[PDB]
Amino acid sequence: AYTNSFTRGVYYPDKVFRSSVLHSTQDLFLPFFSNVTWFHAIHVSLPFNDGVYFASTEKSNIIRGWIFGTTLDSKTQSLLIVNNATNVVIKVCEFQFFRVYSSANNCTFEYVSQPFLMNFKNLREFVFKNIDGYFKIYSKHTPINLVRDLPQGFSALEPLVDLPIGINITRFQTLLALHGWTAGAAAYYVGYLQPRTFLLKYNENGTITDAVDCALDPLSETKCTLKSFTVEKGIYQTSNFRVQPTESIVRFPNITNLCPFGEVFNATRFASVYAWNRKRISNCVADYSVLYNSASFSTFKCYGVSPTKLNDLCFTNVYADSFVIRGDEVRQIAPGQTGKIADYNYKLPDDFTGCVIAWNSNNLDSKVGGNYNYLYRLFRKSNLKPFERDISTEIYQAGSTPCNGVEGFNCYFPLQSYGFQPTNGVGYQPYRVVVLSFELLHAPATVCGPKKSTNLVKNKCVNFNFNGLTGTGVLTESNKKFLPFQQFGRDIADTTDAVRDPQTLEILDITPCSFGGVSVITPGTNTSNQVAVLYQDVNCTEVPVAITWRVYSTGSNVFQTRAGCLIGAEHVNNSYECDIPIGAGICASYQTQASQSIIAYTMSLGAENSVAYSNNSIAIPTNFTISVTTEILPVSMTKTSVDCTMYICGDSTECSNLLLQYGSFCTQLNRALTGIAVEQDKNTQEVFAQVKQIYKTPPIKDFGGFNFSQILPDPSKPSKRSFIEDLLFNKVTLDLICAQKFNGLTVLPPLLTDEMIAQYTSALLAGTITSGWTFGAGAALQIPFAMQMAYRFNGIGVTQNVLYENQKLIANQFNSAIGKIQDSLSSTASALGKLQDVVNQNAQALNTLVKQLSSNFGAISSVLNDILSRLDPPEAEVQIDRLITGRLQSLQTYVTQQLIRAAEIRASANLAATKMSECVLGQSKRVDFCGKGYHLMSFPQSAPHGVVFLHVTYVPAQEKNFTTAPAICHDGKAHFPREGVFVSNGTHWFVTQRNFYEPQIITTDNTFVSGNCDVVIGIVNNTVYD
């Protein structure tokens, strides 16, 4: 039987308390939704690889006992756990498989301890792990409902005990004791752990409440990468994919330059004993396999080198000595061994980096009468130096008297050769011995081996090697024309691009295994859980054959695009607004095409339109909308202060004295940050403090129907802000601050408090609504808001009569616009994106800075205190200086990023100051500067580290067609409109303003004369009143 493990196989990774923190771990866990074996134990009257997760839900404690080992037959040590009524007993010994075991031999360690395990069934979760000879056991007891077959539910297993088990473990078994055998059946669950990366969520109590398997599905991969349980709708770049190579191929030239070492093995007569000949070969190829294949031998023992080792080791100055010796003298030449021949004929150095090969030579050297030609000398002045030969025939005085002349009593220089006979000498028969030594100690290398190659593969990623040039990828037919001296080809980027086969002189291109970006496209995690996967710049004929999660690699949804391919969304022919941009004009959405799914499509650039252009057709608007639009501008950012001493050094005197050497760097960093903070204050002053005096709105708020109650301050609230200002303040969200403060990263408060910023804004509002643009230039001059509105209308080329004749309508439009602003700000949280993401950037920068303190930067650890405690000053300081360099580099990176961010914030603040000067303090003519349409006025509103402009704009609407002429000819002379345009309703002609349909009688006042009507193209005929 089998089933799926939903949320089981989770434990506390280490004995450490945490709280309200999402922690990422890499350890042995049971993967989520895994193939868990449902065992049933029934009587008729398992491999332990990378830990085991064991679950039991049976009653009456029926399942009692565990076995772990490699053989479990008392040949090798075994681990056994057994439980009964009162306690639990553990052994690690060789038990012969008390019905459990027969005999106890070689027993070394046993453990006796507290009990572990004490119709609603209960789960008894156990986890067994074995790492570097340490066996950790984890457990948990959880009563549940009846049956439920591994229900939905999460809980982690606390550790109980760890065992120092020093034996290889391969298989584990369960045992149980039963009460004539009673018939019975039971059930348990077995799961296998893998090296996985998990994300654990800790509650306020520090209990692991929930987990995410990062390496299960793309959605959980995005969850683990963002370190959050909720993922906002969009596209997120996850870990990069690379198709792995298939095999390894090695290419070398054909076999050349052979060592003729067979001939010296096949020599008719070998070198003498006392007069051994020394020989050296180099610059060829030798093998040991063929050496004992062609020339078989049985008497050989080698010192310091493995028989297989000689084949791959590359010689320059190898010493070879071959001679015929007696079988009993074959083993006597070993260094430090005493003997007549060793001390007076030939011996090897103590540091003999070599080995001996011996074989029989009786049948090739011995005669019937004996070979009396292998003469030697078992007499010398002393123990001769290693690798020395002597042929000087000086008489040796062996006896007590100076034996001189031809001979003496038992005195002679040479000795008669051994009676070398085939059968008579049992171990005295001659043997040929060759001693090969390789005490090289030299730069050149000559004699290594044929350096064997393998078969050639093509059109497939491989680990290719060409005469030491190593790489990975596919090979293809080469169009390059090499030259005989050229071997491989490089490109502009100094990388290998084409290589020639050293065996046969054919050349192939090199292209490493195709790869690209992996992106996950998701809607809101709350909205849905199905995701799409984008493979960037990879042809998706390759990923399906590349089928760690590869479930989606052979999905029925594949769409190919310029950006790459998309899997998990269906391409559709119709075009919508872009929601999630994919790239190269492809956008993804989540909709029902009634079941909802992810789709991909070509983005629409807006509704198709054809402007009704003609010779003489104009469209004139007859109505307008007073559109009030919010423009959010960041003005300042959180003024940050950092002290080197607190951050870089954990209040250590030694670290402080080592850091004082970098005083220049620290003063530069402090100067840069102080400059940034003073610049933030200057930004706020330049944007807001543009008024010499603080103006006050009158108690009578009568502005000809315009209602400024939502933007003017309300005395009720303690901080005298407005309704809209309060909404903006609530929308932006401004512990980790305590940790930042404790690590020496402080936030200096702005010079201007939110109260005085609101007071500056209120002064600007009062000046704007009571004086208009005049308070910007010089002394504030009072003017009714109606006539200021008439002036703003006159500014955009609309005659002031329009506003006075529609005063109530414009006032109602403005009020409804403010109402819509209030509703939009109250409803959605996406309004103040810019200020919120600025705050998020600053918070992320500070969090990254605090997190880099965990990096060791190649030191022993990331904490100075343990370094000081565990190290004597010199090694302590040689670690601490590296740590200081790392942390100073992190601080420099932070300060540089802050300088660039402060430059962009200063650009935004200069733009905000320009907008306050040109939109608030006056009416701007710059198109689309102070909002979309014809700008009328603006209202500043303070917001957390920024400003909001309520750009009031005139937008024409309800346009209609008219017939138009460039000029009028009345009395043979052309007439032109003073300021407006000629239009005809079909019968009569009229002069009108260009932004509001208002026809007027064509008279001498609104028109001026110029030349005659035979030059202007498109002039028409009409009459002009005096």
Ligand X SMILES: *[C@@H]1O[C@H](CO)[C@@H](O[C@@H]2O[C@H](CO)[C@@H](O)[C@H](O)[C@H]2NC(C)=O)[C@H](O)[C@H]1NC(C)=O
Ligand Y SMILES: *[C@@H]1O[C@H](CO)[C@@H](O[C@@H]2O[C@H](CO)[C@@H](O[C@H]3O[C@H](CO)[C@@H](O)[C@H](O)[C@@H]3O)[C@H](O)[C@H]2NC(C)=O)[C@H](O)[C@H]1NC(C)=O
Interface with ligand X (CB under 6 A): 203-205, 539, 541, 610, 612, 619, 959-961, 1021
> What residue type is 725 in one-letter code?
E
Among 110, 158, 407, 755, binds its own copies (CB under 8 A): 158
Ramachandran quadrant class, 493 (left: phi over 0; alpha: psi -120 to 50; beta: rest): alpha
Q: Which of 977, 969, 951 is nearest to 1017 (CA)?
A: 969
Q: What's the sign of the alpha-carbon dihedral 158, 164, 170, 171?
A: negative
Asked if residue 489 binds its own copies (CB under 8 A), the reply is no
Give me 387's structure tokens. 């690798």
Element housing 310 (H / E): helix 309-312
What is the contact mask toward ligand Y in residues 597 to 636, using x (rule: CB under 6 A)?
--------------------------x-------------
Assess 504 for contact with ligand NAG (CB under 6 A).
yes
Please say which residue, 133 or 663, places its beta carbon nearer to its own copies.
Answer: 133
Which region among 140-148, 480-488, 831-839, 899-907 touches its own copies (by CB under 8 A)?
Answer: 480-488
d(CA 378, CA 384): 11
Q: Quick one: which of 495, 591, 593, 709 contacts ligand Y (CB under 6 A)?
A: 709
Q: Least separation, in Å, of the C-beta of 375 and its own copies?
A: 40
Instruction: Give the shortest CB-156-to-its own copies separation in angstroms.
Output: 10
Report 120-149 residues binding its own copies (CB under 8 A): 133
Task: Report the candidate in 643, 676, 640, 635 with the shortest Cα–Cα distance to residue 899.
Answer: 676
Smallest separation, CB 989 to ligand Y (Å): 9
Q: Confirm or reject binding of residue 526 to ligand Y (CB under 6 A).
A: no
Using CA atoms, how far apart are residues 352 and 359, in angstroms rounded to an integer? 21
CB 614 within 8 A of CB 596: no
Q: Is 963 a residue that touches ligand Y (CB under 6 A)?
A: no
463 binds, among ligand Y, ligand X, ligand NAG, none (CB under 5 to 8 A by kind): none
The two three-digit tokens of residue 215, written as one number = 């390496």
985 binds, among ligand X, ligand NAG, ligand Y, none (CB under 5 to 8 A by kind): ligand Y
Residue with tokens 């077995």: 190
Among 180, 402, 749, 986, binds ligand Y (CB under 6 A): 986
705 near its own copies, rule: CB under 8 A: no
By CB under 8 A, residue 414 contacts its own copies: no
User: Of 81-89, 126-134, 863-871, 975-983, which part binds ligand NAG (CB under 6 A)?
Assistant: 81-89
- Report what 787 binds from its own copies, ligand NAG, ligand Y, none; CB cut-off 5-8 Å by kind: none
Instruction: Report d(CA 167, CA 224) in Å as an integer.
Output: 36
User: Residue 309 binds which entry of ligand X, ligand Y, ligand NAG, none, with Cβ cut-offs from 5 to 8 Å by kind?
Assistant: none
- What's the CA gap between 630 and 940, in Å, rounded? 10
Q: Is 574 in the site for ligand NAG (CB under 6 A)?
A: no
Here's the x/- map for ligand NAG, 524-553, by CB under 6 A: it reads as: x-x---------------------------
CB of 91 to ligand NAG, least distance (A): 9
- Under rule CB under 6 A, residue 86 binds ligand NAG: yes
Q: How far is the CB of 792 from ligand Y (least distance, A)?
A: 19
Per CB under 6 A, 254 contacts ligand NAG: yes
Nearest CA to 448 among 259, 178, 280?
Answer: 259
Backbone dihedral angles phi then psi of residue 410, each to the nearest 5 degrees? 60, 25
Min dist CB 159 to its own copies, Å, is 5
Q: Does the protein bind its own copies through residue 468 (CB under 8 A)?
A: no
Per-residue binder mask for its own copies (CB under 8 A), 437-466, x = binder: ------xx----------------------
With CB under 5 to 8 Å by kind, the binding choice for 205 among its own copies, ligand Y, ligand X, none is ligand X
Instruction: List Cβ neighbours of 331 (8 Å cut-off, separation of 6 or more).
Output: 301, 337
Q: Which of residues 515-534 bind its own copies (CB under 8 A)?
A: none
Per the listing, tokens 């959980």 go with 220
Q: Map the footprint of ligand NAG across residues 601-620, applying CB under 6 A.
A: 615
Among 49, 106, 719, 1021, binds ligand NAG (CB under 6 A): 106
Smallest gap, in angstroms, from Cβ of residue 984 to ligand Y?
8
Task: Based on the shown chain and the rule CB under 6 A, indicate whether residue 176 belongs to the binding site for ligand NAG.
Answer: no
Helices 873-915 and 663-688: crossing angle, nearest 10°? 20
Query: Is 483 near its own copies (CB under 8 A)?
Result: yes
Q: Cα(78)–Cα(64) distance, rounded to whole angstroms?
A: 17
Closest distance to ligand NAG from the beta carbon of 914 (Å): 35
With beta carbons less than 8 A apart as the criterion, state whether 351 and 439 touch: yes
Q: Which helix (H) or strand (E) holds 818?
A: helix 807-827
Whether 393 and 405 have beta carbons less than 8 Å apart is answered as no
Among ligand Y, ligand X, its own copies, none, the one that 573 touches (CB under a kind-dependent 5 to 8 A) is none
Q: Going by DSSP bridges, is the β-strand pair 596-602/570-571 parallel, antiparallel, or unpaired?
A: parallel
Does position 166 interact with its own copies (CB under 8 A)? The reply is: yes
Residue 4 pairs in a beta bridge with 35
Give the CA distances from residue 91 to residues 80, 112, 129, 181, 1007, in Å, rounded to whole numbers and listed in that order: 5, 9, 17, 27, 114
Q: If DSSP codes are grouped into helix, strand and coil, which group holds residue 411?
A: strand
459 binds ligand NAG (CB under 6 A): no
**Identity of the residue, 127 or 462, whose beta carbon is nearer to its own copies in the bound complex:** 127
Q: What is the DSSP letter of 917?
A: I
Give CA–CA dist 87/122, Å, rounded.
20
Q: Which of ligand NAG, its own copies, ligand Y, none is residue 709 near (CB under 5 to 8 Å by kind)?
A: ligand Y
Helices (H), 852-965: 864-870, 873-915
Exactly one of 988, 1005, 1009, 1023 binds ligand Y (CB under 6 A); that residue is 988
Residue 941 DSSP class: E
The stretch among 115-123, 482-490, 512-520, 987-995 that binds its own copies (CB under 8 A) is: 482-490
- Identified binder of ligand Y from the candidate list 560, 575, 812, 841, rule CB under 6 A: 812
| 715 binding ligand Y? (CB under 6 A) | no
Residue 73: Cβ within 10 Å count: 12
Q: According to the binding rule CB under 8 A, does residue 164 interact with its own copies?
A: yes
C-beta closer to ligand NAG: residue 504 or 591: 504
Tell me which residue of 799, 796, 790 sits closest to 704, measured CA to CA.
790
CA-to-CA distance for 743 and 773, rounded, in angstroms?
A: 49
Is residue 840 within the footprint of ligand NAG (CB under 6 A)? no
DSSP state for residue 385 in the 8-state scheme: P
443 binds, among its own copies, ligand NAG, ligand X, none (CB under 5 to 8 A by kind): its own copies
Which is it for strands 247-251 and 462-466: parallel, antiparallel or unpaired? parallel
Query: Which CB atom, from 145 or from 615, has the smaller least distance to ligand NAG?
Result: 615
Q: What's the min distance (Å) between Cβ of 449 and its own copies? A: 18
Residue closer to ligand NAG by CB (options 71, 746) is 71
Residue 740 φ then ψ, to 5°: -55, -50
Kindly state the tokens that stand for 330.
């074959």
Question: What DSSP letter does each residue of 47-84 carry, written as one string?
Answer: B--S-EEEEE--STT----EEEESS-SSSS-EEEEEE-
Distance (Å, whole) CA 18 – CA 203: 8
What is the 8-class DSSP label of residue 76? S
How many CB atoms sit inside 10 A of residue 1003's CB? Answer: 11
**Positive/negative CA dihedral, 136, 141, 147, 153:** negative
Residue 707 engages ligand Y in binding (rule: CB under 6 A): yes
Q: Fill in the amino acid letter for 636.
A: S
Where along the sequence are the contacts to ligand Y (CB under 6 A)? Answer: 623, 707, 709, 723, 809, 812, 985-988
Interacting residues with its own copies (CB under 8 A): 133, 158-159, 164, 166, 443-444, 483-485
Binding site for ligand NAG (CB under 6 A): 2, 4, 35, 82, 84-87, 89, 105-106, 254, 503-504, 524, 526, 571-573, 615
